[PDB]
């Protein structure tokens, strides 16, 4: 039922422009991209050791 | 003189054991597990790869152009190991008159390793693909020269031993705050796969992985150090190994997380985005020791 | 006296190497690099032995102007390979 | 000795090549402008090399006017590069 | 063994033998690596570490690297073997006999030459300097300076402005 | 404002790294002339003797004494 | 918190043998972990499972040393497990 | 878990730890004071030159 | 002698530890091939890496259907492979043509072009059954290289 | 896999002719000698990913010939599994696209989730992937009692799993530099080309198939169709991620509405 994708330029003046300009002068979104991968490292790996553990199956 | 042999064989082991850490850290970053079937925790695989790739694995020649193909690994492995010589690990192996000049030159001479390998194959598609990879290495050495010349301009001469004395209580990360971000990206130059990717295959990347450790230690001196302490060399070395390896994990982080930049846009990162920023900082770092007294 | 008998000899050998040709125009520009390299060493020895201190900057300036010619002349070589197929001394039109 | 440090690295590098070979038994003119810009910038960096080396003794009022001037023309060259550079 | 500069000077000319001879631009390109790298050592032996490493940074870290591009742009793929090439080996054999035959006469110190200057011993007078200075000395401790030579900085800047603009107008 | 307010916020929106290239390099030129702190750096730079000192033969001369601590000569004592 | 996790690792080594027990499990199997044992199998297979651990936790079906005449001590695959794989290893809940 | 990853770091805490210790411990054998001096500028070289002239003719670093 | 026989075990163990594959896509099988990378059935737990490296690679895994158009394409790749090489036919198409056996355009199961060492039988070759493309291959390396 | 003959004028591509059909298995002539029930698993093996989105198009086409409406419950299985394929198809549409570019992490992040997704296929049908399940007679076999609780439990955990991609790939400076402005096609020429999938739907044209022509119990299930602004790859990417977000709502409404009866 008609969703949209584009935001059509959210920046207007001073406060909404400089923070969008901040993620190009310095990075921040790279640190935000680092954050999701950091939490992904600390959670336990879901691995099955084949000759000893076996994958789930059906009847 | 046993020290040179104590900076080749355990150094090549660090390159060999890198392949495990690259597979295990990136592994845990991808929810899979590292090597385990090989040894106790896969620790017996770096020697297992050495027996596999060298002894029984042969080379089918594409053309073998007499002098080349055998000359390119000498420029690869040889120049990567000579970089270890002037490094200020407590008391360096024959301390240079100018440290960083030898560091910047042998890294810029390491460009030939990928150049001569481009000449090694007769096919035109290989050399055009090779020159594209040279273009990445050639461009980021301009920024590598600029950032170095602005860091040294703050404190110290070209000697690497004086770079320890300036970081007695304060790291060079904080005064060179935009340069700390800048140098970290510019180190990804010698085919690091994180920004963009292009004798036998085995020993060729043994030099490329060695350059990654080389830049990791070079960051750990120019930006890190904490103290020196001439009384105990042990307290510095334990502290240095933690600082260097924390930056080694970060090169395994950028490769894991981020896709290729598009070659053209990677060349648009330089000249258009990086070079206007670094030269403005280079202008700024000229004025700083003149504005406030500090010319050692 | 001792060293100058070799580096002057290397200059005269490169002087022959420039004017002698085997159709390749790339090799002449490569020898122009060697000519400036031989001039670099010959200037370095004269300034470093007789402690000038002021004249030490001069071969550094000479090194800059070495690369000025060995790039702008090299760019013209590319223009020959744009108009013609491959760079050759034999491939000419001027009378 | 520096030659003792160099030769030992190169001889063991060539020794690995001996193991690598003997032991087993069974176009585009646009990229040229990159090399041109690189070489021309190297010399400006080479002129800007003695900055943390000559500033220790020499007068600062004479140097600062000249030191920035080299970086200015290094950016002015890039200002000419911005107007139609290339697709690459 | 006793000589330092004289042994390296022979290898320096040996590189230039491959320039008088024309063994294809690829093998001739290898000459600038051999003679250039040894050419640093000749400068380094008398002193001045900065000026010796300038060849490493510019000639070996730029000049021949850019010359590596143009070899791929024109006259590329395969270099022809110099053993098969006519007169190229003839220029190589005559080139070495102008140097190697001379070295035999340099033995027993003094030698006759085309110029009036003689060879000499080149072992005790090889350095040609005693103590001279002390701190920040050796002539190239303070080598390059923006002070005094203010005029030379401007004109170098002018030519490097020309280089970027002109090559853009050519291509 | 015609271009002071207009052609500044547009530069923040369209390539804000170009703002840093003119501002930081601009402050590198203007600030050294304005600050009254550059005079101290020139004083110690001339005071630091790299070469050996030379003694002059005095015949009725002022502001010169023996090598021991005495109220004579320059001898910079700017902030200890 | 860190002392409690270290004590759990030391108790795990003490559970399955000891100095010779845990070292034999680390070399033959991928990972060593302690749990409740089922035991009963033709040609002495351990099949020590029942633990909660993680996802799909019918863990550790340790292969018997020489099942028929292969001497499976250093090298062993999924060739073992006689008619019990459908319950104790994969699909069903109850022990065979 | 980290009983697998950290042994990969601990092995690097030996091999990469060697060059720092090997360069430091070697001065015990080369010198009777665990120190080697670097010239940098001709003044410090002349001090090393007269140190070989005094007492110990062959040795560079010696007391008195 | 006994010393030579134990040395030949070490050469065999070098391949038994690590196998670097050039996995051919061109199949519905290719998704199940990508399920080796999937953490649940981990394969980087072995000495196997998804870096591929076409010229360097040892064990090319031919996954699924081979048409007459791709028939000369796969053969020239196999010739460029280093001498210690193995071929794993993954899926019923790669074995003898599961479907499309009686079709005009499909080659009847890899062996007519390139010799196969280990056959993986299943259409969707389950990541359970696909770990016999590694472990059974590693088990099969005895070779008995005497002289 | 693909030939792709490139004509490079200098650096930019001028004439890109994809010399495709390198996998012509010959499904066209081979089905002619098979019956309708016999030719069913061929259309599973048409695409690599779709299993219940495939066969769905075939079984309904046989139903249109036979004039037979499938039972009410079977249609609700057809949507529940039809949308779980729509979830499965857009995993590969993002991950292998990221794998072709050079992104290492987001491929593995979804493939553990994807291996948990095939557990639903395994418990409902004997095969891992290609399941002969959607048949001309509606649905072959009923859902087991264990699965219906596990579908909700997965969708509860999928909420954060889809949020992983938008906190990683969409906000990147690299992606907004790369994927933005490649082949901007919004024109009425795209109608003449007739992509219909994500090209027309993800740029300009509002038209889709799910809303206009109902196939198996639609209009009852709520939908949000994402439509972009420009014809670039990035707008075509974001609409697919928004399709992935607006698919759990269909799954949850399928969980709420299950009429008990014949299969
Ligand atoms: N063009 C010619 O060279 C030429 C000319 C005139 C006549 N011929 C005749 O034609 C034949 C051509 O064969 P070829 O020379 O091409 O063969 P070949 O390349 O020398 O290969 C011989 C193979 O046979 C096996 N073999 C040979 N003798 C064996 C033994 N006593 N026990 C076990 N295995 C043995 C070897 O396997 P293992 O390594 O496992 O033992 C080896 O792989 C020859 O027999 C020759 O008499 C040839
Ligand atoms: S064996 Fe099955 S899954 Fe594999 S390519 Fe053939 S039809 Fe597709």
XYZ file of C-alpha atoms in Angstrom, chain I residues 25-28 30-32 34-35 37-41 44 65-67 69-70 73 76 99-106 123-124 126-128, chain J residues 1 3 20-27 29-30 38 41-42 45 47-49 92 96 99 107-108 111-112 114-116 118-119 122 128-130:
70
model
C 29.062 -22.448 -9.747
C 26.736 -22.900 -12.755
C 24.158 -24.952 -10.782
C 21.380 -25.068 -8.181
C 26.143 -23.885 -6.081
C 23.855 -22.729 -3.225
C 24.533 -25.967 -1.275
C 27.785 -21.934 -0.497
C 26.296 -23.710 2.564
C 30.592 -21.262 4.188
C 27.418 -21.183 6.343
C 28.488 -21.419 10.050
C 26.156 -24.344 10.980
C 28.141 -26.752 8.774
C 36.900 -23.410 7.497
C 25.118 -29.477 -14.715
C 27.713 -29.412 -17.501
C 26.332 -28.325 -20.881
C 28.815 -24.890 -24.227
C 30.622 -25.177 -20.859
C 35.407 -24.242 -20.737
C 40.969 -25.865 -20.161
C 17.834 -34.808 -14.709
C 18.713 -33.878 -18.325
C 20.445 -37.241 -18.931
C 18.360 -37.769 -22.081
C 18.662 -34.109 -23.150
C 20.651 -33.059 -26.243
C 22.759 -30.276 -24.692
C 23.986 -31.839 -21.413
C 20.531 -33.589 -5.629
C 20.602 -30.823 -3.165
C 23.100 -31.734 1.886
C 25.917 -30.093 3.867
C 25.956 -33.364 5.856
C 29.107 -19.027 -15.313
C 30.596 -15.065 -20.667
C 24.348 -16.095 -22.026
C 22.609 -19.500 -22.224
C 25.748 -21.330 -21.053
C 23.437 -23.456 -18.870
C 20.789 -24.515 -21.377
C 19.826 -27.784 -19.664
C 16.980 -28.278 -22.169
C 13.889 -28.165 -19.934
C 11.826 -30.430 -24.933
C 12.386 -32.778 -21.965
C 6.155 -36.210 -13.381
C 10.201 -31.130 -9.821
C 11.737 -29.680 -13.030
C 15.267 -26.797 -10.566
C 15.833 -21.236 -10.314
C 18.547 -21.830 -7.694
C 16.618 -20.351 -4.751
C 20.793 -14.297 -1.988
C 25.864 -12.767 -3.307
C 30.022 -11.226 -2.296
C 27.200 -13.032 3.439
C 27.918 -15.217 6.504
C 23.659 -17.847 5.832
C 23.431 -19.085 9.450
C 19.369 -19.277 5.989
C 20.514 -22.702 7.275
C 17.926 -22.309 10.066
C 15.935 -24.800 5.509
C 15.130 -26.603 8.800
C 13.366 -30.329 5.959
C 16.718 -29.873 1.861
C 16.036 -27.421 -0.995
C 14.108 -28.736 -4.025
